[PDB]
């Protein structure tokens, strides 16, 4: 947590969950990292328990997240001189979307009583609506990049801990110590013994 943060783009790191200070001393198992781009003030819709267009039909967050989200603004890499209508989101749906689930099914919404067999008429519209991305828009329409990280404890054992940039260790001089996370009362003298590689 020293290269992805502390950067030039504006960091919208206003999230609830794990402590940012405790991030460097946490060992989570099987974190899911998903990235998506939104338009303007839709950052608030990505929240646990939030109700909205994205939070009900596009990306629903469950009651428990065990973590939080990271968002940043990018009006240069997601904008063009002409219109940028290459990113779409679903707007029409019959039932609520399950949390932590994706349903890639673009079909005709039967809003009215008359069904439509793949032909959009008067009571049928395509659920997918396209975002508008231009460098001349205001804050409420700028392209925002949000990445979601969820920490959890699964059946997989602890293998994500890592070095965590531990900077320590001294010469012996009868100094009490800590061996591999367990405190020690002895001394770190030299050794003439030969160890196996394992």
């Amino acid at each position: 947590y020293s290269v992805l943060y502390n950067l030039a783009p504006f960091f919208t790191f206003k999230c609830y969950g794990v402590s940012p200070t405790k991030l460097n001393d946490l060992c989570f198992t099987n974190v899911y990292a998903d990235s998506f781009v939104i338009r303007g003030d839709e950052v608030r819709q990505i929240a646990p328990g939030q109700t909205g267009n994205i939070a009900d039909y596009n990306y629903k967050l469950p009651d428990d997240f065990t973590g939080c989200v990271i968002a940043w603004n990018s009006n240069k890499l997601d904008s063009k001189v002409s219109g940028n209508y290459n990113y779409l989101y679903r707007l029409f749906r019959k039932s609520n979307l399950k949390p932590f689930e994706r349903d890639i099914s673009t079909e005709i919404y039967q809003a009215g009583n008359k069904p439509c067999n793949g032909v959009a008429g008067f009571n049928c519209y395509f659920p997918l609506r396209s975002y508008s991305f231009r460098p001349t828009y205001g804050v409420g329409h700028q392209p925002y990049r949000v990445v979601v990280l969820s920490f959890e404890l699964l059946h997989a054992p602890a293998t994500v801990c890592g070095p965590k940039k531990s900077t320590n260790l001294v010469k012996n001089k009868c100094v009490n110590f800590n061996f591999n996370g367990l405190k020690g009362t002895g001394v770190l003298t030299e050794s003439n013994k030969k160890f196996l590689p394992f």
Partner: antibody, heavy 132, light 113 residues
Framework: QLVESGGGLVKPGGSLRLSCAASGFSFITYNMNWVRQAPGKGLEWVSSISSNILSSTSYIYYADSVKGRFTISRDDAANSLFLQMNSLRVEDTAQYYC???????????????????????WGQGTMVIVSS | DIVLTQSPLSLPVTPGEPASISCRSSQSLLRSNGYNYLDWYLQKPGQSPHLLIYLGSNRASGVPDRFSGSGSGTDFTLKISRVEAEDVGVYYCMQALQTPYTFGQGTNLEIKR
């Protein structure tokens, strides 16, 4: 669709490059096709392709002669469409309209049968003549 | 194939009189659902072959209400309330059974001043 590129004198044994250019639109959610035209009565249909947002591998719709001679390609990242021609036997006039379809949803379409709704984005601005 | 002949198109039309153009069908226009998968395109010469009525007896793309379709099966025609000076263009009926479709014959509008 505003201006389509690709035009000039090409030998019958040569190759042709056709590309479409347009403005901001939901270009990845439409199954655009190619339509030719004659100076007299009676137009012609060249080829049809499907977008990759409705199907994983999309759909293919070819006739006999346009399968034997013509080829189509997509990009799925920019506002361009590719229409190559490895060989050309008889092609005097060709406008190659860059129209889309009025169907964002595709249903009950097999590899050789697919209803269409309407073409509302016809494009002009190119012309190819052989032996000119 | 599906090649067909439209109306003879040598019809003298005057303002204040409706104009009916009819094209028939070799086979039934019935696939999947029972909708009338037949179109009509207004190809005014010079810029683009636009459309006036899509599949079914409905209106779309901001077409004026003077143009309207009727009939089904091997029976189809158009009705125009009043022809104008901007309606000139060749006509064509577009059948939506399969993607290898053939084209009909069209002629520009005739107004008898």
């Amino acid at each position: 669709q505003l201006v389509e590129s690709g035009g000039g004198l090409v030998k019958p044994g040569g190759s042709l490059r056709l590309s479409c250019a347009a403005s901001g639109f939901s270009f990845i959610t439409y199954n655009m096709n190619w339509v030719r035209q004659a100076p007299g009565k009676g137009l012609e249909w060249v080829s049809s392709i499907s977008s990759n947002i409705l199907s994983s591998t999309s759909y293919i719709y070819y006739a006999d002669s346009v399968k034997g001679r013509f080829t189509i390609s997509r990009d799925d990242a920019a506002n361009s469409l590719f229409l190559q021609m490895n060989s050309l036997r008889v092609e005097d006039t060709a406008q190659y309209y860059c129209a889309r379809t009025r169907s964002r949803s595709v249903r009950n379409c097999t590899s050789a049968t697919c209803p269409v709704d309407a073409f509302d984005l016809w494009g002009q601005g190119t012309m190819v003549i052989v032996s000119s | 194939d599906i090649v067909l002949t439209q109306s003879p198109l040598s019809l003298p039309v005057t303002p204040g009189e409706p104009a009916s153009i009819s094209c028939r069908s070799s086979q039934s226009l019935l696939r999947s659902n029972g909708y009338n998968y037949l179109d009509w395109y207004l190809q005014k010469p010079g810029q683009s072959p636009h459309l006036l009525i899509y599949l079914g007896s409905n209106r779309a793309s901001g077409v004026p209400d003077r143009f309207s379709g009727s009939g089904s099966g091997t029976d189809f025609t158009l009705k125009i309330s009043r022809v104008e000076a901007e309606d000139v263009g060749v006509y064509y009926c577009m059948q939506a059974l399969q993607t290898p479709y053939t084209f009909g014959q069209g002629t520009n509008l005739e107004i008898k001043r």
